[PDB]
Motif scaffolding. Structure first.
Motif, PDB file in Angstrom:
ATOM      1  N   UNK A   1      41.430  33.306  51.108  1.00 12.21           N
ATOM      2  CA  UNK A   1      40.109  32.739  50.928  1.00 12.21           C
ATOM      3  C   UNK A   1      39.066  33.779  50.571  1.00 12.21           C
ATOM      4  N   UNK A   2      37.879  33.285  50.244  1.00 12.52           N
ATOM      5  CA  UNK A   2      36.790  34.187  49.933  1.00 12.52           C
ATOM      6  C   UNK A   2      36.049  34.625  51.176  1.00 12.52           C
TER       7      UNK A   2
ATOM      8  N   UNK B   1      39.198  42.418  48.424  1.00 18.01           N
ATOM      9  CA  UNK B   1      39.171  41.232  47.578  1.00 18.01           C
ATOM     10  C   UNK B   1      40.288  41.259  46.539  1.00 18.01           C
ATOM     11  N   UNK B   2      40.200  42.186  45.575  1.00 18.88           N
ATOM     12  CA  UNK B   2      41.137  42.177  44.446  1.00 18.88           C
ATOM     13  C   UNK B   2      42.581  42.126  44.927  1.00 18.88           C
ATOM     14  N   UNK B   3      42.871  42.741  46.059  1.00 15.65           N
ATOM     15  CA  UNK B   3      44.243  42.777  46.505  1.00 15.65           C
ATOM     16  C   UNK B   3      44.697  41.454  47.079  1.00 15.65           C
TER      17      UNK B   3
ATOM     18  N   UNK C   1      31.816  39.315  41.052  1.00 12.86           N
ATOM     19  CA  UNK C   1      31.867  40.258  42.155  1.00 12.86           C
ATOM     20  C   UNK C   1      32.464  41.564  41.661  1.00 12.86           C
ATOM     21  N   UNK C   2      31.840  42.673  42.066  1.00 15.51           N
ATOM     22  CA  UNK C   2      32.248  43.982  41.593  1.00 15.51           C
ATOM     23  C   UNK C   2      32.110  45.005  42.704  1.00 15.51           C
ATOM     24  N   UNK C   3      32.855  46.094  42.551  1.00 14.66           N
ATOM     25  CA  UNK C   3      32.765  47.203  43.475  1.00 14.66           C
ATOM     26  C   UNK C   3      33.487  48.426  42.953  1.00 14.66           C
TER      27      UNK C   3
END
Ligand SMILES: [Mg+2]
Ligand SMILES: [Mg+2]
Ligand SMILES: [Mg+2]
Ligand SMILES: [Mg+2]
Ligand SMILES: [Mg+2]
Ligand SMILES: [Mg+2]
Ligand SMILES: [Mg+2]
Ligand SMILES: [Mg+2]
Ligand SMILES: [Mg+2]
Ligand SMILES: [Mg+2]
Ligand SMILES: [Mg+2]
Ligand SMILES: [Mg+2]
Ligand SMILES: [Mg+2]
Ligand SMILES: [Mg+2]
Ligand SMILES: [Mg+2]
Ligand SMILES: [Mg+2]
Ligand SMILES: [Mg+2]
Ligand SMILES: [Mg+2]
Ligand SMILES: [Mg+2]
Ligand SMILES: [Mg+2]
Ligand SMILES: [Mg+2]
Ligand SMILES: [Mg+2]
Ligand SMILES: [Mg+2]
Ligand SMILES: [Mg+2]
Ligand SMILES: [Mg+2]
Ligand SMILES: [Mg+2]
Ligand SMILES: [Mg+2]
Ligand SMILES: [Mg+2]
Ligand SMILES: [Mg+2]
Ligand SMILES: [Mg+2]
Ligand SMILES: [Mg+2]
Ligand SMILES: [Mg+2]
Ligand SMILES: [Mg+2]
Ligand SMILES: [Mg+2]
Ligand SMILES: [Mg+2]
Ligand SMILES: [Mg+2]
Ligand SMILES: [Mg+2]
Ligand SMILES: [Mg+2]
Ligand SMILES: [Mg+2]
Ligand SMILES: [Mg+2]
Ligand SMILES: [Mg+2]
Ligand SMILES: [Mg+2]
Ligand SMILES: [Mg+2]
Ligand SMILES: [Mg+2]
Ligand SMILES: [Mg+2]
Ligand SMILES: [Mg+2]
Ligand SMILES: [Mg+2]
Ligand SMILES: [Mg+2]
Ligand SMILES: [Mg+2]
Lengths: 51, 53, 185, 148, 157, 223
Positions: free
Chosen positions: F192-193, F218-220, F114-116
């Motif tokens: 969670x995701x 997400x990353x946080x 997963x990327x952003x």
RNA sequence: GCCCUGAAAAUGGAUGGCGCUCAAGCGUGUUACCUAUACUCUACCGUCAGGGUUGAUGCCCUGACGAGUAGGCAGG
RNA sequence: AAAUAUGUAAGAAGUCCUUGUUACUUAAUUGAACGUGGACAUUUGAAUGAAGAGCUUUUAGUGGGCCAUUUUUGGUAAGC
RNA sequence: GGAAUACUGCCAGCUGGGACUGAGGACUGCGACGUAAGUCAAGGAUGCUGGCAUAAUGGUUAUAUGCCGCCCGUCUUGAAACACGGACCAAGGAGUCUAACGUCUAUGCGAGUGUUUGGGUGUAAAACCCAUACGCGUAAUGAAAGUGAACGUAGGUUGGGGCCUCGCAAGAGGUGCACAAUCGACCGAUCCUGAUGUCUUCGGAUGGAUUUGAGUAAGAGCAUAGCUGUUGGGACCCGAAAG
RNA sequence: GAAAUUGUUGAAAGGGAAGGGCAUUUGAUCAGACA
């Protein structure tokens, strides 16, 4: 012998990166931007609310 | 391109300015302002199923 | 779990100390490990690893090798370093003087430097004189002239020496060695 | 000695170092040199080319040493002179008195041509010198004396 | 020798500690703990007694009186965390209390005559003030308990 | 010997005092540089609207990628690309300069990661807490600006915030300044995701693919 | 679409079981929760590596890594 | 006439100037090779990574395989 | 027309509750707070208090409860198998030794090396000592008769560690062993060339050739030992029907 | 005077085998630290 996390432990947050001091003291975590009156013209809202 | 590179480096060294002879890949893009004069966004809809046979 | 890009727990393929138990060899190491560590002196490093080398890796330097090296221009007055044993060579006649630093000298080789007016030095003596290794020539023997190397890479049309216990005609000379009987190598 | 052997280390593991599939049996592939022309052929060509067949002439009741002719090079040749006496002949370098080298007494039957010699003339008593062997001897003022 | 001796042996010198950075900073008690608040004693000999809080000692305890002539609890220490601090507060203005500190209860069968006086001293003042609000004396003589259905995570105390 | 220590000591105490106020000067200049950069884009959007035009943002030059898939049963082409971006381990993550050359390394790698587009607040919080350096192999925690300055100083970048500025701006030393950062070993998302089943596009039911601004939330949680 | 008919096999029996009917079913959406030898942080064993320093198989600092039949080596 | 796959290239072993060698080759001092001397190193001529690269010897075990996705042949089909 | 609020995002904003962890052991480091002297939560836990001082913690063990666990060994793509061996225990029980070898390693000596067939000697199978030979190596190449290794500082070029000079450095130049690539020279084989000669058919100078060799080009070998691998042997152990 | 295997005595457990692993209860038992 210990990783300390600058985002806690203010001693370290100051050890890297002074201007932490300035930041906090001047706030600017806040800091309202100035107040402008630009209004979107016409066609923009004509097409915004369009079908 | 080595001819072109050699000659670019010369016209740069004769003027004493920066070289940069190695190609960069395509960079993402830059900020644009597209206008609405003459182009009003013409809004589109999905199409009903239709048999053409 | 990891997707490794390289073999884990893989050890360096280099000798970390010599395989010998010779206590004087150990001492010579203990010297040059100190020398290599505390000096810049790239010479010291090379000698350090050189002391670890296996017999097959320390081929004798003959006394003629040293002589022809001293004939390089400007080399005449350097002191030769050979980590290994140095051998005598009858084939030369006029031998220069200079000085040699070596693990071991053969009788003939010792007499042949000395009788030329030169000097025999061990590596610790060479160390005291050239702590940074000043004005040294380092020499290595021809390790690839060994007998066994005749047989490495043996193959068809490879031109190497087959492993053979006896030599002459009728010993592996016939079918495949000559166009007339079958094929040729 | 035994205790250094791997088969000591293989105590406790079934099958020794031999594998559980193809085991270790007596003589798969045949005893000794079997099938050098059939199933071992790939090994015999490549690592033993020319193994099979004949070549050359037969020679009946060949006696070695009928051929005894040990070879010596001008590359050395001066080693035959004892090392003490060597320097005097080398400094002298006279045709009037020049050293006698009897190569056959030293156990050599032929003088070959490798190397170079110093300009000192020598007397070489030998059987069988090579053509370049002689020519370098005469250029230093020596001669070759055929003996037997 | 039955066992070959060590080639090494360790040093019997004892190392000194590193110079530790931990200051002794002063405790901060929760807001609800203020002198004169009626406490519910959660454990200990007097557990379940309702008791009056006087002085915050320097060893972090609480000075408790309770007071003796009402509920039998004497002047005494109590630990911060073993107590429920109620919302009913009798004023301690009229209670000297300056004399009770760490070394007061210092270990130095029998009860000291100064102790017994100091009790009557602190209590005669207290009972006076407790009488100012009706039923507070009865409330402090009674023992606390969770009845069926009580929910300490609901109950306001 | 007894005096010349106060020589070498009072010396460095001043060269520290100096390096310090330089960082204090620079970090102040970065704060203004961001604050005005964002503020311009906002008004530029306002201006376009008042003019009846549309302001289109420039495409992002900077993308953060964390590998959300296990290390088993990976095709060989993606397995290479995954290593070449230094994500050999689940949840580990790095930064990528965005060009067409690495854009296709995001295409091939897409089902496993997963990327952003990370925000300043992310990049900052990444580098402070999980920031580690690469010094002769070994993974070094970045606790003192000297550690940065030592390795990255030849490029400028004597401060952890110069690293953070170098990253978020891309620019000249991004290649080296980035490669100095040890890949970020992240925990699993706390909270969670948010999707039942991970490996499906973000468009499709979340987790894996380019979630654009959403990489930050997400990353946080992981960090 | 879901439901019914179409739909016949041999010991007694399996949505895993119980049981479930505005479900505990079917379609779909929203959260909260459960928990792998996996991820994150620490401690410990070992392996490799880099560095320092005059029980030398030494002492010290630092990082990374750890699946395994057949098999090879290594220390015991 | 795709997609996926695939060959080659992205420099110092390069580029340019000058002009040596030769029995080859040209009608020809032309070319072809291989050179002397001179010039140009910042970004040393895409990206990413690189935890190092290169190289030698020697020898175990194995040489019944099987499965999943997709492509796919025989077969009505098969846990073929 | 002026707000508010949702949403999303940010704060180097402040704060309550709980959990696990406390590695390290004089000092050195980066800092922070102070006018200051000092202080600190800043390169890993200290302070204060209580109980016990023993089966209390703990170890062991038997039992009980919860959840989990098919019988090993072997062949096999696949074994808990309705594949096979195994009722139980003890003691025995299987890659050896030898001859000759490949690599690698260590040791001795080194253009040499191997004392132990033998002789001398002896405190008597030991140790100690030695003449002549012999084996391997120091020359290769042809089936063979035979011939047999320097144009040149033992060659040119391209890379090479170390050393040398200049330089504060960055670097620049010089020399460059081992090793690698490539062009050349030498020796034998093969095919041309066929000079001076000579006895007339012997001799083979000189210069060549997309040909060839387990070759030369300032030697590396020899011996003793160890692991591993090779082969012959009963050859890891037990086993045929036969002859 | 070992093992298989057995008699007695002593403790224990046992609703269609037994035996194993993690964990604590219980019972039995036992080491370690201060004058
Ligand atoms: Mg084993
Ligand atoms: Mg095994
Ligand atoms: Mg067994
Ligand atoms: Mg084996
Ligand atoms: Mg078997
Ligand atoms: Mg086999
Ligand atoms: Mg056949
Ligand atoms: Mg010669
Ligand atoms: Mg009462
Ligand atoms: Mg939760
Ligand atoms: Mg899920
Ligand atoms: Mg049912
Ligand atoms: Mg169910
Ligand atoms: Mg419903
Ligand atoms: Mg439902
Ligand atoms: Mg486990
Ligand atoms: Mg180490
Ligand atoms: Mg090193
Ligand atoms: Mg070390
Ligand atoms: Mg030391
Ligand atoms: Mg050591
Ligand atoms: Mg050890
Ligand atoms: Mg060491
Ligand atoms: Mg692991
Ligand atoms: Mg393992
Ligand atoms: Mg492994
Ligand atoms: Mg094989
Ligand atoms: Mg098979
Ligand atoms: Mg099947
Ligand atoms: Mg508003
Ligand atoms: Mg909000
Ligand atoms: Mg501690
Ligand atoms: Mg217990
Ligand atoms: Mg079960
Ligand atoms: Mg079987
Ligand atoms: Mg079989
Ligand atoms: Mg089985
Ligand atoms: Mg079955
Ligand atoms: Mg069977
Ligand atoms: Mg049976
Ligand atoms: Mg047998
Ligand atoms: Mg055998
Ligand atoms: Mg019979
Ligand atoms: Mg018969
Ligand atoms: Mg018994
Ligand atoms: Mg009986
Ligand atoms: Mg019992
Ligand atoms: Mg039972
Ligand atoms: Mg566990």
């Amino acid at each position: 012998v210990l990783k300390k996390n600058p985002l806690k432990n203010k001693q370290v947050l100051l050890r890297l990166n002074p201007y932490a001091k300035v930041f906090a003291a001047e706030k600017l975590g806040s800091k309202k931007a100035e107040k402008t009156g630009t209004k979107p013209a016409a066609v923009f809202t004509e097409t915004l609310k369009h079908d | 391109r080595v001819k072109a590179n050699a000659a670019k480096r010369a016209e740069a060294k004769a003027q004493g300015v920066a070289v940069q002879l190695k190609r960069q890949p395509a960079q993402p893009r830059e900020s644009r302002i597209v206008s609405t004069e003459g182009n009003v966004p013409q809004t589109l809809a999905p199409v009903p199923y239709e048999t053409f046979i | 779990g990891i997707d490794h890009t390289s073999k884990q727990h893989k050890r360096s393929g280099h000798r970390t100390a010599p395989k010998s138990d010779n206590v004087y060899l150990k001492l010579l190491v203990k010297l040059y490990t100190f020398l290599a560590r505390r000096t810049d002196a790239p010479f010291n490093k090379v000698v350090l690893k050189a002391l670890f080398l296996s017999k097959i890796n320390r081929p004798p330097v003959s006394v003629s090798r040293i002589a022809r090296a001293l004939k390089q221009e400007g080399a005449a007055n350097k002191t030769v370093v050979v980590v290994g044993t140095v051998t005598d060579d009858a084939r030369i006649f006029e031998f220069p003087k200079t000085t040699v630093a070596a693990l071991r000298f053969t009788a003939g080789a010792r007499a042949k430097i000395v009788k030329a007016g030169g000097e025999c030095i061990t590596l610790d003596q060479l160390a005291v004189r050239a702590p940074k290794g000043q004005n040294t020539l380092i020499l290595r023997g021809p390790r690839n002239s060994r007998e066994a190397v005749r047989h490495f890479g043996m193959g068809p049309h490879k031109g190497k020496a087959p492993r053979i216990l006896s030599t002459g005609r009728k010993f592996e000379r016939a079918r495949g060695r000559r166009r007339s009987k079958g094929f040729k190598v | 000695p035994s205790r250094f052997t791997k088969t000591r280390k293989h105590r406790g593991h079934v099958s020794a170092g031999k594998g559980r599939i193809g085991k270790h049996r007596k003589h798969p592939g045949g005893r000794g040199m079997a099938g050098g022309q059939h199933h071992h052929r790939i090994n015999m060509d490549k690592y033993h080319p020319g193994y099979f067949g004949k070549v050359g002439m037969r020679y009946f009741h060949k006696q070695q040493a009928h051929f005894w002719k040990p070879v010596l090079n001008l590359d050395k040749l001066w080693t035959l002179i004892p090392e003490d006496k060597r320097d005097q002949y080398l400094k002298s370098a006279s045709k009037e008195t020049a050293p006698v080298i009897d190569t056959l007494a030293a156990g050599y039957g032929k003088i070959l041509g490798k190397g170079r010699i110093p300009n000192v003339p020598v007397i070489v008593k030998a059987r069988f010198v090579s053509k370049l062997a002689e020519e370098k001897i005469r250029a230093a003022g020596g001669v070759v004396e055929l003996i037997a | 020798s039955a066992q070959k001796a060590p080639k090494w042996y360790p040093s019997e010198d004892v190392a000194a500690l590193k110079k530790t950075r931990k200051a002794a900073r002063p405790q901060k008690l929760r807001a609800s703990l203020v002198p004169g608040t009626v406490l519910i004693l959660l454990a200990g000999r007097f557990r379940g007694k309702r008791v009056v809080y006087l002085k915050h000692l320097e060893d972090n305890t609480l000075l408790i009186s309770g007071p003796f002539k009402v509920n039998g609890v004497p002047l005494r220490r109590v630990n911060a965390r073993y107590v429920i601090a109620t919302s009913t507060k009798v004023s301690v203005e009229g209670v000297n209390v300056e004399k009770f500190n760490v070394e007061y209860f210092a270990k130095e069968k029998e009860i000291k005559a100064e102790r017994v006086e100091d009790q009557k001293v602190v209590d005669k003042a207290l009972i006076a003030e407790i009488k100012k609000t009706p039923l507070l004396k009865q409330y402090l003589s009674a023992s606390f308990s969770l009845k069926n259905g009580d929910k300490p995570h609901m109950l306001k105390f | 010997t007894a005096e010349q220590v106060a020589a070498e000591r009072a010396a460095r105490k001043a060269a520290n005092k100096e390096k310090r106020a330089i960082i204090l000067e620079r970090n102040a200049a970065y704060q203004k540089e961001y604050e005005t950069a964002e503020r311009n884009i906002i008004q530029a959007k306002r201006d376009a609207k008042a003019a009846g035009s549309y302001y289109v943002e420039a495409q992002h030059k900077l993308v953060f990628v964390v590998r959300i898939k296990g290390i088993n049963k990976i095709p060989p082409k993606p397995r290479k690309v995954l290593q070449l971006l230094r994500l050999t381990r689940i949840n580990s993550g790095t930064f990528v300069k965005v060009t067409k050359a690495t854009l296709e390394l995001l295409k091939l790698i897409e089902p496993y990661v997963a990327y952003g587009y990370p925000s300043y607040s992310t990049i900052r919080q990444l580098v402070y807490k999980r920031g580690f350096g690469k010094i002769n192999k070994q993974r070094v925690p970045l606790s003192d600006n000297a550690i940065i300055e030592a390795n990255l100083g030849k490029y400028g970048i004597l401060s952890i915030d110069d690293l953070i500025h170098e990253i978020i701006t891309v620019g000249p030393h991004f290649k080296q300044a980035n490669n100095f950062l040890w890949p970020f070993k992240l925990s699993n998302p706390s909270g969670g995701w948010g999707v039942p089943r991970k490996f499906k596009h973000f468009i499709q039911g979340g987790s894996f693919g380019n979630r654009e601004e959403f990489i930050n939330k997400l990353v946080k949680s992981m960090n």
